[PDB]
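pipeline/complex-builder :: batch 7 item 3
reading input block
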Amino acid sequence: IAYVIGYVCVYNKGYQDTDTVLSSVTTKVKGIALTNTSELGERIWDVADYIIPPQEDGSFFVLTNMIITTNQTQSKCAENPTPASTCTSHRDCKRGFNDARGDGVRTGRCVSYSASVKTCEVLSWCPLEKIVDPPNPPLLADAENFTVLIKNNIRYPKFNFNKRNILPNINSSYLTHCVFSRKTDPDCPIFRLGDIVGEAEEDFQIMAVRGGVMGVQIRWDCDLDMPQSWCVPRYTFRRLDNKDPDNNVAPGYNFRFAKYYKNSDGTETRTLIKGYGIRFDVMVFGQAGKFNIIPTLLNIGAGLALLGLVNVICDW
Amino acid sequence: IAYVIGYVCVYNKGYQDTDTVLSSVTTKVKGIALTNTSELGERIWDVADYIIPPQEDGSFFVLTNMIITTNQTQSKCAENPTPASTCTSHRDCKRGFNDARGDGVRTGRCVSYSASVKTCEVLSWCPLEKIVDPPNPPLLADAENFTVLIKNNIRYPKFNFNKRNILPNINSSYLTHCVFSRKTDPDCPIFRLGDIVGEAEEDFQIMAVRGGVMGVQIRWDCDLDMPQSWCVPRYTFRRLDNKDPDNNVAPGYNFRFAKYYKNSDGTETRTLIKGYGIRFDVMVFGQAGKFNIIPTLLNIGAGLALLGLVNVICDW
Amino acid sequence: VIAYVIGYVCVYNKGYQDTDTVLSSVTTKVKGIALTNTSELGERIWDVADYIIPPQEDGSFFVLTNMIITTNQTQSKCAENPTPASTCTSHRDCKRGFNDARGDGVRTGRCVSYSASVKTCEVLSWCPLEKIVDPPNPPLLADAENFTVLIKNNIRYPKFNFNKRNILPNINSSYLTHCVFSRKTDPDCPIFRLGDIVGEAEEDFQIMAVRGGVMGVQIRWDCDLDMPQSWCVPRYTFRRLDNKDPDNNVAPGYNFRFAKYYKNSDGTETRTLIKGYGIRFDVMVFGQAGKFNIIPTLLNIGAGLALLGLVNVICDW
Ligand SMILES: CC(C)c1cc(Br)c(NC(=O)Nc2cccnc2)c(Br)c1
Ligand SMILES: CC(C)c1cc(Br)c(NC(=O)Nc2cccnc2)c(Br)c1
Ligand SMILES: CC(C)c1cc(Br)c(NC(=O)Nc2cccnc2)c(Br)c1
Ligand SMILES: *[C@@H]1O[C@H](CO)[C@@H](O)[C@H](O)[C@H]1NC(C)=O
Ligand SMILES: *[C@@H]1O[C@H](CO)[C@@H](O)[C@H](O)[C@H]1NC(C)=O
Ligand SMILES: *[C@@H]1O[C@H](CO)[C@@H](O)[C@H](O)[C@H]1NC(C)=O
Ligand SMILES: *[C@@H]1O[C@H](CO)[C@@H](O)[C@H](O)[C@H]1NC(C)=O
Ligand SMILES: *[C@@H]1O[C@H](CO)[C@@H](O)[C@H](O)[C@H]1NC(C)=O
Ligand SMILES: *[C@@H]1O[C@H](CO)[C@@H](O)[C@H](O)[C@H]1NC(C)=O
Ligand SMILES: *[C@@H]1O[C@H](CO)[C@@H](O)[C@H](O)[C@H]1NC(C)=O
Ligand SMILES: *[C@@H]1O[C@H](CO)[C@@H](O)[C@H](O)[C@H]1NC(C)=O
Ligand SMILES: *[C@@H]1O[C@H](CO)[C@@H](O)[C@H](O)[C@H]1NC(C)=O
């Protein structure tokens, strides 16, 4: 008798009708980066430069490192050295054979890539992207000091509940100059990228050399029987990409994009950037419960049946 | 006896095995806007101009107002007036100090922004974006008359159910020239942005002056025991961003993007646009139920146990 | 019925399971090269930076297959396309300032001769207009049939504190370097082929790519945590998501328009408008996991005993 109400009715939440969450997320990134490499000279980077695409709210990408190829035009051209594409004679290379290496469609003739070696001749954007390891340290290290503001609006449809992650006790003056600290400022929604990466027990620079995927998990576990002010979100940070170099393929997170230009004579030129960066995904989940009568009665009946069973067992 | 079957078996849906929904959404926007401001002259806007990014199906952004800065180049330059960045002497400004205001990295020297005042000297894209309130009325007011077509395809995996929001009774001739009216055309999926904003008890112009977030909620609550034709979606519209100027930070919804150009001599120029617009999010949710035997028997047993309990109570 | 309860309700109904949903992240990378040799454009190659718009939309990627290109478009006063609803009989026929829903532009009072035979209302917009021309057949990027896509899915069950990846630990990197997905031969390879994905839905790639369409990759994570961890594997299914009946749907296929902007020496702005038809792949991850519990088991046992009492009473009568 005491056991049923003690555990099944209370801790198991059998007296609760439950619902899931419907959420929307808005992210705004602020920060400025500087680069002083010899190849590019002296350059600054603002919010319109290191975020690709410009608006991907809910999952934003921050550029940290890049490889740039300029003055690329559609032309016949030479492949990079490779044992599987080395040219012994004109009959070695096959015309029209599309390769999976990403160079381009092959032609019958082959040309000398350098004095020492010759390779098959293909038509593509040239000059090709050199196979070079990304620079270390990363070009946009100062991305460690960027800030991100996250605004989350949740709704429980069955209970007709709407909530925001910005508590009503918080004034705008404090939000103007604010930062998230686990011990000092738990209600600030303005996180730091370096802090987010550190909370997962990782170093920002090593991750940003080759990129990676990070995930911000917001948990809305709210009991609507309790007062509304007890409904608060819980923030957790977790890496989402494999680090073992033996099991995964294509470590880190990188992708290629391009800029197109037209010259005076009308010819088209392309600048190809392969960017390595850290992609942050906002993952919102939760479940809410409210008191109900029918589930309570069914659980009480099942508990009484279990009491009858245990009484019968003890009788024997 | 009558109570159990009357309420617990029927209204509580205890005889139902339930499943969630798996949905895909496709949105297409049509409309044309005109602008006749003195700064830009006389310009037209089509679907390829006021949607950024071009394809974000499921959550589309419609530009309504903008601030444009042109001929921005990487150079040493002067900051905007600010009490926290006012220059008293060369020793006042600190070289290499990165600011959170978004201007750029500071240098030791400082220069006169105007005759009256002088500020610290920084290197960034210049000329800077002037701190100017967005124009009122909004530049793209005609965005009130745009139309959006929403196609939603849902599936319940456990029951192997597939459904579309376009009913089979609807012919293409009616869909060619169609609009959504709550009282007249409830099955048309072609909504009007002005109507969507009005259904939330708001004015379109005021919202579009500074932007905001809107949310279209589609509810698929379908009982598969009933015939298939009874499975229809329900559309609701709700604002998702705070309007109180005292609690939220960064009111409205705006973001910055850029266009890059290359001159004949090779120098790079940027045109920075800060755009204010209304972001519509499509939020699809639902739950379906079908008859089952085991849950029915368990509920009948629990009801009989409750009947035994109430009989015992009445005996005492 | 004592046997029946344990045989069916306790075991097959999974009444002894506390259940949780899945929280997933998806990463997609596309590799392939296309060639076009049309007379209008000449001889062009296409890489991963050309046929994917936008460049990063991980979880739902769009692959360009066919396109219509209009060049040298500038803001100017100009003439409309022929149309019975926009044909000009006289200057009083066209109304100035009347915005149309056809997508041409705002109308002006005057009207001009589109050709010698016919005249139409005069509007200000980007010109020359996009000609109303059927998309080329066969599609320009047919070689998109041979592209490959790598899908990496990371799932978590929060209540049970479970984290899993779709790349099994038994798989080595050497096999993943040169790998392809075959239902009968290589079920654990996550490197799919677009042609194979379309074929698994009983469709032809070329016909779909002529006008575009929407495809959906469904990954099912139905894992029983009571069983060992190695039994937790995903199941891949492929389904078309857009209607094919030309009588019920509107705007068949999947296409959208985008633009490129250029600035000339004198400062005037020019636009190149591309209407692209392509196949959009959506990754849809769903699942549910269960683990043993005591309270649900006891409640189900009690309900089964109550049902046993009911059936005994019924048999007595
Ligand atoms: C020329 C080179 C040094 C260079 C310049 C810039 Br600016 C950027 N950054 C961007 O283009 N960001 C961006 C924004 C919006 C859409 N697409 C991309 C890069 Br990666 C390389
Ligand atoms: C020069 C100024 C008057 C101007 C011109 C245009 Br055109 C636009 N619109 C866009 O660039 N839209 C858009 C589309 C695709 C990708 N990125 C942006 C803007 Br906001 C300002
Ligand atoms: C000039 C014409 C032949 C042409 C050239 C190209 Br290159 C492309 N392709 C793209 O522009 N892809 C793309 C990538 C990133 C952002 N926006 C678009 C197209 Br459709 C037409
Ligand atoms: C950038 O580097 C150059 C030489 O490498 C140096 O003269 C200059 O002071 C540097 N600027 C900054 C801001 O570090
Ligand atoms: C980030 O800011 C701190 C404090 O100003 C500074 O010490 C650190 O060097 C900055 N990070 C980088 C990469 O410069
Ligand atoms: C704003 O909120 C902070 C948070 O503690 C508080 O210290 C401060 O007094 C508040 N300001 C006003 C004017 O109430
Ligand atoms: C735009 O404004 C100019 C002057 O401000 C005027 O002459 C012209 O008729 C206007 N055009 C439209 C379409 O309103
Ligand atoms: C939208 O259309 C209506 C009817 O044609 C018109 O009265 C209204 O002015 C239009 N909106 C704007 C912003 O011009
Ligand atoms: C098309 O559907 C509309 C909707 O009511 C109907 O009025 C009309 O008769 C239908 N047309 C045909 C040809 O059936
Ligand atoms: C492209 O077409 C031209 C003529 O139409 C032909 O000369 C050339 O060989 C073709 N190239 C390829 C790679 O098919
Ligand atoms: C795809 O590859 C196969 C095998 O190499 C080839 O037969 C086929 O023609 C290719 N597809 C296209 C569209 O060329
Ligand atoms: C890599 O995995 C494949 C998969 O069967 C296997 O055949 C091969 O022997 C493995 N290589 C090594 C070095 O274990």
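note: The helical segments of chain C are 2-9, 173-177, 194-199, 205-211, 295-316.
queue -> next item
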